[PDB]
A paper describes a structure:
In complex with [name], the inhibitor is buried in an N-lobe cryptic cavity, with only 2% of its surface exposed. Compared with unbound [name], the αH10 of the [name]-inhibitor complex is elongated by one and a half turns over the conserved glycine (G634). This shortens the hinge (from 27.0 to 15.4 Å) and replaces G634 at the stem of the flexible hinge with lysine (K637), an amino acid with a lower tolerance of the ϕ/Ψ dihedral angles. The analysis showed that in unbound-[name], I631 of the αH10, along with other nearby residues, occupies the cryptic cavity, preventing small-molecule inhibitor binding. R686 is further stabilized by N507, which is allosterically shifted toward R686.
At the cellular level, [name] acts as a negative regulator of bone morphogenetic protein (BMP) signaling, which modulates cell migration, proliferation, and apoptosis. Ubiquitin transfer requires a motion facilitated by a flexible hinge that connects the [name] domain N- and C-lobes. To gain structural insights into the mechanism of selective inhibition, we crystallized the [name] domains of both [name] and SMURF2, without and with a representative [name] inhibitor, compound-8 (Cpd-8), and determined structures at 2.05–2.75 Å resolution.
Residue numbers in the entry: 375 to 437, 441 to 560, 563 to 749
The structure:
Amino acid sequence: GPDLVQKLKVLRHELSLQQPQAGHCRIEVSREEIFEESYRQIMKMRPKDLKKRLMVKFRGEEGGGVAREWLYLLCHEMLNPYYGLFQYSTDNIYMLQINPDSSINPDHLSYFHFVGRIMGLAVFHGHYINGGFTVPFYKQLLGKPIQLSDLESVDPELHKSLVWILENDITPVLDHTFCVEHNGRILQHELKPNGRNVPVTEENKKEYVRLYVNWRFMRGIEAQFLALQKGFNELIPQHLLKPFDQKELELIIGGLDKIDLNDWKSNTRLKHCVADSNIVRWFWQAVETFDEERRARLLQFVTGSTRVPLQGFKALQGSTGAAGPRLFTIHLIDANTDNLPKAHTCFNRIDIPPYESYEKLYEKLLTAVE
Ligand SMILES: CCOC(=O)c1c(C)[nH]c(C(=O)N(CC)Cc2ccc3c(c2)OCO3)c1C
């Protein structure tokens, strides 16, 4: 709380001291080749050059304020799975993770080092990017261990079984060793040296669960993660992150998930209504009134998910029909004003009856959502 506020000020003050008063960090890339061009221009600089005031300009545009736009666009474009560095999770929708098969590109480690530098530059200049990584990824990047509690949301079944180990006498029921498996070929991993020959007992099961928790996230991505963290720490040294505790890191990480209302409203299709009509202004008014958890519940009420792809509301998918985005739709219909708004989750549509006032829309929409 108030100690977190002050820790953030110490961090920002320390970072500001590393920025030279004179000098600039010059970048000039195109929008359609921002990843490859930024890769070559950034990997040419010293870490101290990256700490200079950003001097950015796009391909052939006049545009200071362009450096904010450049960094934000590069932060989202570098996570695009086309580049083979990151892939979507099969545990939670629209979440990202390092692709363990990134070894295909033999220069992958220099690209992960580059991604780390850009993530470090975002923190350095005060940008909050909703990268969509898991809480364990972000804790590890910020220099802290993963907690068993952080596994519950990613892998509830593994979490339940590791919790079972810690809370019960395993002796008459389980016969595990410090060796774990995962995939086409089956790969064995010894959690600690000679692990295959170390049976899990009451005496060492705490170490077993602790090692298994880390492996569940680090599995096949350890070299990639190390290079990423290396780039990140060239901008954000690990000692400056030491004061933040597990709880403060969870608050900072949860704040990254903020739904972008600008991107939501810019990418909303309107059916039988205009952008200035009372029903549409009242809907966006009620959304602004809702806290984050209520904004997430509204997004889940209409789309079935509490998140949107990394590209944003423009990449929103529908369930059926021709391939292509199915934008979030506000549909003003002809219906009973006592009726609730109706969600058509297959098509990301909310059918809204013609309410008389803002206060009636707010209550009906809140009743539908809660
Ligand atoms: C401990 C103090 O934390 C901070 O002050 C802080 C600030 C100012 N920004 C960030 C932050 O946004 N990220 C963490 C690196 C997420 C992120 C950035 C760039 C990305 C990305 C995700 O996906 C690819 O590009 C944090 C945590």
